[PDB]
Symmetry: D2
Subunit: 191 residues, 4 copies
């Protein structure tokens, strides 16, 4: 079982390196920083196994899983997301290998931009390329998604319809808040 | 002004001590693992510039700065409106400081800081807000800064609209929470 | 096994709170000489708790009496800094000192034990926390001694044991020359 | 003076990124003996850059040629670890080594190398020089003290204090020698 913890060591180190890197973006800006804060997480073994058994994964290719390592970048404004995206695409300390835009959204109201990078981790024995998922979200998107995640866990994937209807209303309310915020930003920018 | 950096030392330490304390609440829950009434905690000591400036707009003599309740400040952000009362009650029950005032919900605590030369009781303001309110409030504060306290009418309208949208979001979240708890 | 990590939660939080407090001392000083160089803290792993419980025959219902489930280490530059730190700790009002032992007066270290009034969700929990105060040279020697004793399962060969003893004497002489540097400057 | 802190921002970020990288080495090892005990990093204060800026003949036009505005220190338990860390650093591909100087071979002992770190910024890449020193714990202790004394006495320690500092460097060296023999003995497994 520490074969697991030995397997996850590079993923954890990739996340810590990328956290300090991405947090440097906001520091460099202190005008308006396009990043409010940054979090990162390596998937717990249980959650790796559960998803592997839910999506057809024999345990020998789990290394194909794109989100064992994950970061989340939270932005104040919707337009900040495109800015962060472009910064990430320009970085030379990793390469972007995949992306998908749920901002351009899901049936329940999930809003988030995803990309996956291949991070060239320097190890004791040389280089190891590890997949790291990076999501970019507004604060309001992140708030809604966090609640949805908690409810799906609490109800084991079967949220009762009365709660699901309200969750869907909350996603629209979060979306409207982001729209009003966008109007504020655009109006300030017509400087 | 090294006079300043020395004056602010206790305030900064009180904030760091209180941050680790309050962040421990969430930790206590999420082993548990049910719902933490705290989502996150931030803290800041007011910059020398902003202390002086506020001192001069409500007419405060330089020997009366230590009376200011918000040189040191923390902010506690909660998911749900109902969490705010839960956090409030937790803070009133803690024995490692005393609550001396209250009125976003804010309270002020007196923190018995241990220093090398003995004790120093320092005032620290604690604001408790929902995430949605914090988001609006951060933008309002920034605009108030950018426009030096006189926000233009075309921006203030949009800020009011954002405030209403934040309110609607908190209301839906509250309804979600209300449905879940009657389990 | 989930019972264990819930049991250790208060110990971890006590350590994190004490670390930030004790690191504040150096901050308060930094112009002058800080009696503290750095601060570390650790909660003993369940494995190590159980094993010590079995060597000093502690019923699992009595483990909470163990003084070093939670531990901090304070490292100082000079031997004289240790007395200064000791006095600071005895004067603090955010905990109470309940025990101490001085191996400075080849293992060298000062130990004390405090009772920390941890604020929890359900009220107060008083937790025992061991605080060791050491010079850098002392901590270095003790760290090596601990590692070897682990590698050799408590039975260090005589050829390694002789060198470890000479090393503790070298560490002690290093501290002595450092003390003389301090004693002279101080005689300003 | 705000030009100073904008100037130092990349240096600070380079140090923070390299700290997390180098601290990952020990983690990777824990199980086994880590050749690294701990890692610190520092950007030089404006005052100290300027003072060094030409008591050592450097125009502020070319401050960036200074190799130690950004600095890291790697502390090892054993003298033999230093060579291991050195070889690890030369093998890394996330920077390039551009200079080195060896005082393992006043009583000062330390191995130095200088790397060029390709910092990703908002405006593209910035290559910054970062000095990395590798020291035993006992060496680092002594050097920390000398540096503090050199500050107290504005760069010329009086000799009655300097003599003892030399005796102290010799005491640290002897501690390292016994530890080396211990390491040297255990490995003969």
């Amino acid at each position: 079982d520490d074969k697991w913890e030995r397997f996850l060591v590079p993923y954890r180190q990739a996340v810590e390196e990328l956290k300090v890197k991405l947090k440097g973006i906001r520091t460099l800006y202190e005008d308006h920083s396009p990043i409010e804060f940054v979090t990162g997480r390596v998937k717990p073994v249980a959650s790796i196994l559960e998803k592997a058994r839910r999506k057809s994964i024999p345990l020998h290719e789990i290394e194909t899983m794109q989100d064992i390592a994950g970061l989340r970048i939270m932005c104040q404004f919707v337009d900040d997301i495109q800015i962060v995206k472009e910064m990430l695409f320009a970085r030379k300390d990793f390469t972007v290998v995949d992306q998908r835009d749920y901002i351009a959204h899901k049936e329940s109201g999930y809003r988030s931009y995803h990309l996956v990078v291949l991070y060239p981790l320097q190890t004791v024995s040389g280089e190891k390329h590890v997949l790291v998922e990076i999501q970019i979200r507004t604060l309001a998107m992140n708030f809604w998604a966090t609640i949805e995640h908690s409810l799906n866990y609490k109800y084991s994937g079967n949220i009762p319809e009365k709660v699901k209807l309200r969750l869907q209303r909350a996603s629209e309310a979060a979306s409207r808040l982001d729209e009003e915020m966008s109007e504020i930003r655009g109006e300030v920018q017509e400087a």
